[PDB]
């Protein structure tokens, strides 16, 4: 645990080093595990270096000694305006959940940049519901079952499990997450889910010790049917054609035929 003090010193030391290196820098922020305070042995030191130069996107890596160990350091160098702007795009690592991308401002070039970038996180909105593609992936599962392709079953079930949260988010209390592992935690904790959710979702994701093509296909059939019957038929939320088809009973008829 004296490793951790050497890392904190490495972080402080790197901030000044990054400044010296990037004349176009306007702000330097700590990200990831060390910004959250939950780092462990193999955690990386993660920096964003925001610059004034437009269209810049580069990725730096260092391996540096801390006592008798080496630590991995990384920096994403990015145009400041591009970095601020991506707050309107959903994260790709949260299964569609809205996110709080943890930031700790280390340095900023002036007062106004300081005031603007001194926030505990950068937000991202939820990914939109994908009813149609969830239903298609169930179709792929059924096709793979019919032809005896277990691997195809497992693959398509992952697609169903990756998409289902986009359906469950709107009918659950608002929750955000700050990192990938926590996304699994928030989803598993959703108060409003169909019967069997926890085990079914992990089976379909493939994050279990034991399953079969039969049990996996079964989990997906339960989940899709259970979730669709819980969804409000709102055209702005789900899409006009989708809500219409659900209200007409056509989507149900299709799935159950």
Tell me if 181 contacts a copy of itself by CB under 8 A.
Answer: yes
Return the number of the residue (126 or 153) whose C-beta is nearest a copy of itself.
153
Distance, in Å, from the CA atom of 55 to the CA atom of 43, rounded to the nearest integer, reads: 29
The kind and range of the H/E element at 11 are helix 3-21
Return the number of the residue (193 or 202) whose C-beta is nearest a copy of itself.
202
Q: Which partner in a copy of itself, Cl ion, ligand TOY, none is near 228 (CB below 5 to 8 A by kind)?
A: Cl ion
C-alpha angle 114/63/52, rounded to 5°?
A: 30
Q: Which partner in a copy of itself, ligand TOY, Cl ion, none is near 84 (CB below 5 to 8 A by kind)?
A: none
Residue 231 · residue 250 · CB < 8 Å: no
CA atoms within 13 A on the CB side of 89: 8
Tell me if 135 contacts a copy of itself by CB under 8 A.
Answer: yes
Positions 62 through 101 that interact with Cl ion (CB under 5 A): 98
- For residue 177, the 8-state DSSP code is B
Write down the least CB distance from residue 112 to Cl ion, Å: 17
How many residues belong to the site for a copy of itself (CB under 8 A)?
54
Tell me if 251 contacts a copy of itself by CB under 8 A.
Answer: yes
Distance, in Å, from the CA atom of 16 to the CA atom of 198, rounded to the nearest integer, reads: 46
Write down the least CB distance from residue 112 to a copy of itself, Å: 32
Q: Which partner in ligand TOY, Cl ion, a copy of itself, none is near 142 (CB below 5 to 8 A by kind)?
A: a copy of itself
Return the number of the residue (59 or 112) whose C-beta is nearest a copy of itself.
59
Distance, in Å, from the CA atom of 217 to the CA atom of 155, rounded to the nearest integer, reads: 11
Residues 6 or more apart whose Cβ sits within 8 Å of residue 1: none
Spell out, one character per residue from 199 to 238, where the chain touches a copy of itself: x when CB under 8 A holds, - when not: ---x--xxxxxxxx--------------------------
- Scanning 58-66, 80-88, 115-123, 170-178 for contacts with a copy of itself by CB under 8 A, the matching segment is 58-66
Distance, in Å, from the CA atom of 86 to the CA atom of 90, rounded to the nearest integer, reads: 8
CA atoms within 13 A on the CB side of 140: 16
Return the number of the residue (33 or 215) whose C-beta is nearest Cl ion.
33
Return the number of the residue (181 or 195) whose C-beta is nearest a copy of itself.
181
Residue from 2, 20, 55, 63 binding a copy of itself (CB under 8 A): 63
Return the number of the residue (131 or 211) whose C-beta is nearest ligand TOY.
131
SS3 181: helix
SS3 160: helix
Question: What's the token pair of residue 53?
Answer: 């130069």
Return the number of the residue (79 or 154) whose C-beta is nearest a copy of itself.
154
Q: Which of 241, 244, 215, 246 is nearest to 228 (CA)?
A: 246
């Amino acid at each position: 645990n004296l490793y951790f003090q050497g890392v904190q010193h490495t972080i402080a030391r790197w901030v000044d080093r990054l400044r010296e290196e990037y004349a176009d820098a306007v702000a330097i922020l700590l990200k990831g595990s060390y910004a959250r305070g939950d780092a462990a042995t193999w955690s990386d030191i993660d920096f964003d270096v925001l610059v004034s130069t437009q269209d810049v996107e580069d990725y730096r890596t260092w391996i540096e000694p801390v006592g008798d160990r080496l630590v991995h350091i990384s920096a994403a160098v990015e145009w400041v305006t591009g970095w601020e702007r991506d707050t309107v795009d959903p994260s790709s690592w949260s299964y569609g959940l809205p996110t709080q991308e943890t930031t700790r401002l280390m340095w900023a070039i002036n007062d106004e940049t300081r005031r603007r970038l001194d926030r505990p996180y950068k937000t991202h909105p939820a990914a939109e519901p994908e009813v149609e593609d969830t239903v298609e992936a169930l179709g792929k599962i059924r096709n793979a079952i019919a032809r005896g392709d277990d691997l195809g079953v497992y693959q398509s079930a992952q697609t169903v499990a990756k998409l289902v949260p986009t359906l469950l988010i709107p009918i659950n209390p608002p929750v955000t997450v700050s990192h990938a592992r926590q996304a699994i935690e928030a989803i598993l904790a959703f108060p409003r889910v169909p019967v069997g959710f926890a085990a079914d979702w992990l089976t379909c994701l493939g994050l279990v010790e034991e399953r079969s093509a039969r049990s996996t296909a079964a989990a997906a059939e339960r989940m899709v049917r259970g979730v669709l019957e819980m969804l409000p038929t709102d055209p702005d939320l789900l899409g006009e054609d989708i809500a219409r088809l659900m209200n007409a009973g056509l989507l149900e008829k299709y799935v159950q035929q």
